[PDB]
Amino acid sequence: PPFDFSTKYYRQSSFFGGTTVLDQGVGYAVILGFGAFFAVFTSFLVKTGLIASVIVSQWTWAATILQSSNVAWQYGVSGPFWYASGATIQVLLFGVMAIEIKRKAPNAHTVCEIVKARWGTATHIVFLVFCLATNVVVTAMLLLGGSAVVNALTGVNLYAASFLIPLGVVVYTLAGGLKATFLASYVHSVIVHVALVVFVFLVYTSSKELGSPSVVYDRLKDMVAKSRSCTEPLSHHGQACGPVDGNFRGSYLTMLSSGGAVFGLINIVGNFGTVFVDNGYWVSAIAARPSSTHKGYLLGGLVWFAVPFSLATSLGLGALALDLPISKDEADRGLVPPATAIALMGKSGSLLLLTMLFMAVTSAGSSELIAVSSLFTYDIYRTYINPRATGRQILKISRCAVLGFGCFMGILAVVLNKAGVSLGWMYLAMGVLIGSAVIPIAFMLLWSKANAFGAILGATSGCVFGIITWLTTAKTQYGRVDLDSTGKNGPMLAGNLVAILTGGLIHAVCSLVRPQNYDWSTTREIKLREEKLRRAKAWIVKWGLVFTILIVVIWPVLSLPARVFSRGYFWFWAIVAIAWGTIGSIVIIGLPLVES
Ligand SMILES: CC(C)CCC[C@@H](C)[C@H]1CC[C@H]2[C@@H]3CC=C4C[C@@H](OC(=O)CCC(=O)O)CC[C@]4(C)[C@H]3CC[C@]12C
Ligand SMILES: CC(C)CCC[C@@H](C)[C@H]1CC[C@H]2[C@@H]3CC=C4C[C@@H](OC(=O)CCC(=O)O)CC[C@]4(C)[C@H]3CC[C@]12C
Ligand SMILES: CC(C)CCC[C@@H](C)[C@H]1CC[C@H]2[C@@H]3CC=C4C[C@@H](OC(=O)CCC(=O)O)CC[C@]4(C)[C@H]3CC[C@]12C
Ligand SMILES: CC(C)CCC[C@@H](C)[C@H]1CC[C@H]2[C@@H]3CC=C4C[C@@H](OC(=O)CCC(=O)O)CC[C@]4(C)[C@H]3CC[C@]12C
Ligand SMILES: CCCCCCCCCCCCCCCC
Ligand SMILES: CCCCCCCCCCCCCC
């Protein structure tokens, strides 16, 4: 027993594996009786302070809670920062796109409806597949994290919980109409900003094991020790015993991390492909009013930064200090937060984490069910199958396109849990697959010299050129090609960078040769005023760029001279983390109540 505080663990090969905390009755009632319960609850109840809450609501997926801590268990303190740093980029790209949607195409319901107008019907069917693949990739990795936490904490069979989760979201979507309400989007941002405060104040303030920022420091300095022998009876391969490979001096408390720095690039490339190629973002930008409220997107983006930052800094750095025997596979599957929650407050932190996770799963898997349904009913039914009917049919074949997707996703989730895919491989592989269609979409709304064949070729060749590099680098640097060598940070960076850049270069070189000068006169008709929509854009591209350059660039640069953090500097980091996540938890729960 190397340490006196972790002696009941002596070393195991995994934290989980037997004697589940909860019983199957609790697990079979949460995956099936949460969407229905909230559907009845919302029907029981009949500004720039209510736009921030709705903005925060749809941006919280099941990966925000589970992967931010996965990249904090490795790399130390650079993980949560590099994960959360992609926050002002989204707000800038959402504002500057919601302005142009209102200015150049007011009567559209889907992104692929502005594609058939600008360009032809041959570049429509390519992006109609490149958009339907993103709704599959994102929906398939909140059924991978949801079905692993439930099986771990409770004991429900994972193949039987992968098929019952989508059916609890289909009921929630069908009930309450296939539309969003400002009342149901306010109760979702209240529950997730209460568990955040509870978990942050339990780790650095109150717990009888990890109680102060000066205990985490002394316990994270002892894990990375050069005199710690952990060959075969005192650790295993991927169990995080000693010095970190790639960190300055092997320390967890440093911002000089290379593995954590390349994940920032991967995260940036991956997050650009979900605000452009995902129709769920276009649906929620069409239904906004930038002219009336546009300062509510910055306040709804500066508060979301504290959710993956504070919670990860607590729940991922409190697992290293407690010496839990978490293996690498379990950490990948999304099992660090439930590992810390049982260790700190067992049988009661596990019910709080389940509620916080399934309040995000059910509220983010309903935004994809109404994004695939619209992309079907408005684009493959009333464009090509039957364009002469609009009465009572548009609704039937919109309600019937949710049930089909909720079953296809359920079957595909069963198929990918048998194989062995884990959020953590799908999260990193998103860019390699759908990054080639990002710039051909920005050029559609922002550039007046972009043609159709260039878009087709740039979208359809970048994917192949990215996958070839992604599968080649792993083969030439690791021997074989399987789920292990492919998920490394080497191949994935090459794949992401090739995919995003080649599809932009090919499209922007082939368009300066044969330009199509477009006045947007065809997208403006599909089915004062300009002064406000010109000052709003001026405000956004200034006050979003300032914060982007201030957070992504200046803040990490000034932390490099700190080298290994010293007691007193970690007290500053661990206090910024608590302050952001506390003063962000009042402006969401009390500001949209100063309506009075
Ligand atoms: C704005 C963010 C999202 C991206 C910023 C990009 C660059 C500023 C970063 C990204 C990857 C970084 C590199 C990641 C890894 C290394 C290896 C590292 O090599 C070593 O010193 C370790 C080698 C050894 O000692 O064996 C030197 C810095 C370098 C090139 C880093 C330099 C800074 C880079 C290029
Ligand atoms: C995990 C360890 C053991 C291996 C680490 C390997 C990486 C550090 C190397 C291997 C292959 C390299 C890549 C090979 C090819 C490219 C493509 C290149 O991108 C372009 O050429 C884009 C421009 C265009 O194609 O238009 C940028 C460098 C990059 C990502 C290289 C970056 C460094 C990589 C990822
Ligand atoms: C645009 C140009 C003109 C200025 C860019 C500013 C920064 C990007 C540079 C300027 C000084 C640099 C620092 C100069 C010295 C070091 C010490 C160096 O420490 C070591 O690794 C050596 C210590 C040891 O191994 O004993 C780490 C990088 C750092 C902080 C450098 C990080 C990058 C800094 C902040
Ligand atoms: C040559 C070796 C043996 C010694 C190297 C010492 C430097 C690495 C240290 C010593 C004093 C330090 C400086 C002490 C005070 C400042 C002022 C500070 O600037 C401000 O506060 C400007 C803002 C304002 O005053 O409004 C920025 C850091 C800096 C340059 C520090 C940078 C790092 C310095 C130069
Ligand atoms: C002692 C073992 C090797 C230590 C090498 C550490 C390299 C750290 C480089 C990563 C720093 C990138 C900062 C980027 C900020 C914009
Ligand atoms: C032991 C070797 C340490 C090397 C550290 C290199 C740090 C370079 C960071 C510079 C990034 C500047 C981005 C603008």
Ligand 1 atom with the shortest distance to the CA of 262:
11
How many Å lie between the centroid of ligand 5 and the Cα of residue 66?
25
Structure tokens at 15: 């934290």
* Among the listed residues 373, 345, 355, 351, the one whose alpha carbon sits nearest the alpha carbon of residue 279: 373
Reduced to 3 states (helix: H, G, I; strand: E, B; else coil), residue 253 is: coil
Ligand 3 atom with the shortest distance to the CA of 558:
35
The amino acid that residue 97 corresponds to is M
What is the DSSP code (8-state) at residue 358?
Answer: H
Q: Which residues contact 280 (CB under 8 A, 6 or more apart)?
A: 58, 135, 367, 368, 370, 371
* Among the listed residues 453, 347, 345, the one whose alpha carbon sits nearest the alpha carbon of residue 126: 453
Query: Exposed (0-12), middle (13-18) or buried (19+): which is 164, by Cβ within 10 Å?
Result: middle
For ligand 5, pick from 82, 224, 245, 256 the residue to mutate: most ligand atoms within 8 Å of CB: 256
How many Å lie between the centroid of ligand 4 and the Cα of residue 564?
18
Cβ neighbours around 423 below 10 Å, total: 24
CA distance 214 to 219: 9
Q: Which residues contact 289 (CB under 8 A, 6 or more apart)?
A: none
* Among the listed residues 525, 507, 395, 515, the one whose alpha carbon sits nearest the alpha carbon of residue 448: 515
Domain boundaries in the chain? 24-228+256-289+300-427+528-593
187 in contact with ligand 1, CB cutoff 6 A: no
Q: What angle do CA 80, 86, 89 make, to 5 degrees?
A: 165
- Way the structure was solved: cryo-EM
Q: Which residue reads 């940036």 in tokens?
A: 268
* Among the listed residues 56, 551, 93, the one whose alpha carbon sits nearest the alpha carbon of residue 307: 56
Ligand nearest to the CA of 490: 2
How many Å lie between the centroid of ligand 2 and the Cα of residue 497?
8
What is the residue with the minimal CA distance to atom 30 of ligand 3? Answer: 561
Contact 140, 412 (CB under 8 A): yes
How many Å lie between the centroid of ligand 6 and the Cα of residue 561?
10
The amino acid that residue 254 corresponds to is T
264 in contact with ligand 1, CB cutoff 6 A: yes
What is the residue with the minimal CA distance to atom 15 of ligand 1? Answer: 258
256 in contact with ligand 5, CB cutoff 6 A: yes
Contact 363, 181 (CB under 8 A): no
The CA-atom distances, in angstroms, between 531 and each of 48, 329, 537, 538, 579 are 20, 55, 10, 11, 38
CA distance 207 to 405: 44
- Top CATH class of 24-228+256-289+300-427+528-593 equals mainly alpha
CA distance 186 to 53: 6
The string over 212-225, giving b where at least 16 C-beta atoms fall within 10 Å of a residue's C-beta and e elsewhere, is ebebbbebbbebbe
CA distance 539 to 535: 6
How many Å lie between the centroid of ligand 3 and the Cα of residue 286?
46
Ligand 1 atom with the shortest distance to the CA of 85:
3
What is the residue with the minimal CA distance to atom 13 of ligand 5? Answer: 256
CA distance 573 to 164: 41
> Phi first, then psi: what are they for 92, rounded to 5°?
-65, -50
Reduced to 3 states (helix: H, G, I; strand: E, B; else coil), residue 489 is: helix
Structure tokens at 141: 């990795």
For ligand 3, pick from 560, 563, 564 the residue to mutate: most ligand atoms within 8 Å of CB: 560
How many Å lie between the centroid of ligand 5 and the Cα of residue 501?
25
